[PDB]
Symmetry: D3
């Protein structure tokens, strides 16, 4: 596969997709037994290991829709990947979204033209896989993790005129990131199961703000919720 | 309120929204104790009653986004309606969607220009309220009802060139109706809780077909799932 | 026909299309001899009768483009309907449009995405049939009815940000309703003759306002103009 | 006025707008008494004269929306022009449109982005002024001229992929030219009265074809209809 | 060819395209030896002559994209024209663009819907031919002519809400005219070489202004730069 | 700066922007004296060094418009970066583009919605800075490097329906990559100088194909052309 230097099935059915290829490293080392490293292309590191005896892979995606699309496609098409879970952060855009909250995206709004190219006249609303999502909600509530379930906004521009999120907050969108629409759509197209699990990086239209401690907690917190989701 | 001839609070916190104002009649009579009739404007009948002692309202919406939008707005704005559940049918567009299946929409794609007017450059992905949705899933599984959870397609045209649903089936969209986007968006805007619960009316790209018996079953079946959702 | 429970040709060549299925009732009873009732589906009542010995039908459409589209299509395709005249009201948006004025739409602007789906890069300007329209103008001037002839605006949302009509008034658009584009386009597509005849319901950017008396007059007034249009 | 080298009111209330600045010459010389020439800028000749004692002006527009827009704006804004009538030809796109037929545009479809720039989410349907149009119909029928009344298509490209007109013929659009939308819209914006009167230049999806004789007849024929329209 | 009354090859490989058909006259008479006149249709004059012994043609285009498109297409398709250079003016929109400056467009932004019709989801960025452009830059610097090289804006409307150029100046667009996008695109499509060379007509968001003397200089100045470009 | 862990001015006026953060490493080590490493965030390595005594920086961008936008913005806004040159590859889409050819983008088409968000009704054609571009052409021709100068296509999707490039080849677009539009636009907005320099990675609509040797040559070849461009 053009972008991923890996042997067939040297990659798990299940892949966690952080934006950062260095958090990809971190997650493997700090959470998985028997750490393999299949990919080193573009520094976009890929890893495979076990957790509670089960095989789990970890691939960094880079940032923005066009980048994650690249990896999700190859992972799916060239490695028959079955379950793809994003684990990154997002900028909180409501006030009723707390820094501790862990976010499960049912859907996402986007300004990426990825869908309009393919569909034209249709606002295409992408979709988390319920089984994956329910499992994550269950895995959250049993351990008693703070968890919100709603939509996010997959943006093309980190720095924007940003008129959008101010309007999107008014419709109950929870936060902004740059990957989810791309995951959900490509996963749905190819018959796979996708879900996006996200922590708060900071409040964009500040209601409150974040410390290094709060992130370290919610980060770890999110990885668990993901891992136990199967 | 312009379209609904009703006294303040003569309407419940919770309203079931069938497309048909005559199924609206049916549902009241056949499911609710102490049947009031608040609205008779445009034959778009509105009813209030109790079920398991609790107050439940039933308002017909008519067809298409512009029509349901009318009722949802007034119900919300003029009657502080808290929970709005659609109960209609949809044309099944996948083959793995069975005539018995009861459908819970997490989201919907639309070709209505309702959102693009307000948002512009954004594909806005509307969102069912999770609490309502989870409750419906729970109320489904305990009685053991067949139930699928994914997206639908809110269309503007019953008869189309329909090139869309053939493409939308390829992305795992479950079925086509004409209301949901409009519900989810207006509910989200005004801080209310919405959910759309749907039976199969027939298979549009026929995988299988429907009898009068199968509908009568799933219809009733869906009303229960709704009713026990609280 | 899916939505209209009627026997072949039990429906006239000519159909008046009020939004309200109860004004549909009213019009039949109060204007036509030998009243038949072909449709009772969805409470969207359909009627056939005579006037000056000639067969005339009356079908309610519901509200919004997607709804009227449904009836117009079936009426045309399943009942070879030849002449379709809308008789509803509209919100006056200029000041030089008087509450008494009866409106004949040559065309309509819309924000519905119905046309952009089919045409893409084209602003499609729909068209009243001239013969029908001229006949209505003649039938207006002989009795001496106040009558204006220009465009309207077929909206998707009764409640809007409404920035549009303020801009559209500046271009001489007369009023806003929710049906006409849909009529004109479907009528033109299938080789039929359509026309939309409208009274003022109120002034939206208030220049003046309406009583119950003024409506009763213009309503009746409009039905005549329609009826004598053949 | 930047584009028209003319003294205030040296231009009539009424202006005929042929595309060709040389037919502009022709029309003056061959139809009007006391021929003045106000404009010679860009060879886009402008003329003023009398007909049946009444003052009539004649200004060439050039081709395409952006060009006629230029003249229509200045004529309106800088010379308080009251009535603006286009007199050009169009490519017939239906078969039931005959080479002899004289065309009165109620409206026009366009692919020009002129309107979408100003309106955004609105398909804006431009509008002939009825008074002007009725007068032209009357002036046609009394002399007994063949005359059709419907819509046209204002295109941006003489040579196209042209997929549009094949689809637009299916909706009863009569013919294609390159000016009308631009006239109707600018006329409506500034409170003026516009109308577009058109002959057939040839059949684009050939049903029949044209001689030099047939044009000379219909051309002259159209100028009359225009002239007597007041 | 429909719009150009000319015999095969009575037109040069190289054609200068001023907007004004009278500057077309001027340029021929004042710059070329052995002046032929091939076209007189629509007053849109076409000329052929020699300069430094070499054959050079001069065709007026009229104004706006739809008009120049007409001539560029026929010139290319019916006369195998190889090199097409626009020589007109543009409204300067930055302040760092001086009245003396001669402008070489690498590209242009447009609001014309010409490209979106053909491409859909693509912002198509048109392209000057480098060879032509470099040659013009060389021919500029050797004589020592003030010359800027960047983008312009091909507008559909001389009079606009004009919100665009205020935003476009902020991105370094140099000036606004009404032809270039149309040239570059049609030239690129048919394998020909195009370039647009432009003087300042005035400053639109005034930084400074123009005399008749400054234009006469830069005009002549621009024709040279064009002519020596081969 | 959020994404780049660097001290003020520890970054040069001039930055080379390869997609790959590992080619970023390579370029530094193999071309620059006194190698500093300012950034290690996300493995997206940043380096500063000298070449012919002059300070030159090297920052990886990742893939797709949203990603490079991130770095270009911070580099510009937080480090007053003056000159930004992309050095990556592109998929050749014409046949007359040779594997050896080095490509200088004057402009790029895109399907990214980055511009349409900001501009709306405008196809915005981005622009290489001429000074940078000319300098690169000069630095190419003196050493005698094969070099083509035209447009490219900045895509959002590596894997597409790809109907676009087949149409875009027909208009003389040279190749497809995923960064340039984003560079040119952000550079132009902030008053900086940008240029994109690209090798062929392979032929997408295969005319010919590539070896490892041909890339190693053209790669090195391109870095020179960049480096000597100042
Ligand atoms: N736009 C945006 N705003 C935020 O506040 C935010 N917080 C996290 N992210 C995610 C998404 C990207 O992968 C990447 C960009 O830093 O991280 C954000 N994106
Ligand atoms: N488009 C469409 N296709 C179907 O097969 C279908 N089945 C049910 N519905 C819903 C939605 C409307 O409220 C209304 C239109 O009949 O019923 C459908 N809509
Ligand atoms: N938008 C809108 N504004 C008005 O003031 C108005 N007056 C009448 N109508 C028509 C059209 C609908 O069928 C229906 C909505 O009430 O009635 C209106 N629609
Ligand atoms: N597109 C197009 N097709 C035709 O068959 C046709 N016939 C006449 N016209 C009008 C409109 C222009 O002003 C001008 C272009 O020749 O003439 C036409 N335009
Ligand atoms: N829009 C616009 N603004 C100007 O300041 C300007 N200056 C010159 N031009 C060019 C382009 C047309 O061919 C024609 C319109 O007058 O001349 C301009 N166009
Ligand atoms: N779409 C696309 N097709 C190609 O053949 C191609 N060749 C190189 N590139 C550039 C651009 C990306 O940064 C990145 C994606 O691999 O590399 C390409 N992109
Ligand atoms: Cl992330
Ligand atoms: Cl329904
Ligand atoms: Cl109505
Ligand atoms: Cl014409
Ligand atoms: Cl010009
Ligand atoms: Cl690259």
């Amino acid at each position: 596969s053009v972008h991923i230097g890996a042997e067939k099935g040297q990659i798990a059915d299940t892949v966690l997709l952080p934006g950062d290829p260095l958090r990809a490293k971190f997650i493997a080392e700090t959470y998985l037994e028997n750490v393999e490293c299949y990919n080193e292309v573009r520094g976009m590191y890929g890893f495979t290991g076990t957790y509670k005896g089960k095989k789990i892979s970890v691939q960094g995606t880079g940032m923005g829709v066009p980048s994650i699309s690249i990896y999700v496609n190859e992972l799916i098409q060239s490695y028959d990947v079955q379950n793809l879970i994003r684990v990154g952060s997002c900028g909180a855009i409501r006030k009723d979204v707390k820094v501790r909250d862990v976010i499960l995206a049912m859907t996402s709004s986007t300004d990426s033209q990825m869908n309009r190219v393919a569909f034209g006249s249709v606002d295409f609303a992408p979709c988390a896989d319920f089984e994956l999502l329910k499992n994550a909600y269950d895995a959250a509530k049993d351990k008693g993790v703070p968890v919100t379930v709603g939509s996010v906004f997959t943006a093309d521009q980190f720095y924007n005129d940003d008129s959008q999120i101010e309007k999107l907050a008014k419709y109950g969108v929870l936060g902004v990131e740059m990957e989810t629409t791309a995951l959900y759509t490509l996963a749905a197209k190819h018959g796979r199961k996708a879900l996006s699990i996200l922590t708060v990086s900071d409040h964009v239209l500040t209601g409150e703000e974040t410390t290094a401690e709060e992130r370290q907690t919610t980060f770890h917190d999110m990885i668990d919720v993901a891992l136990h989701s199967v």
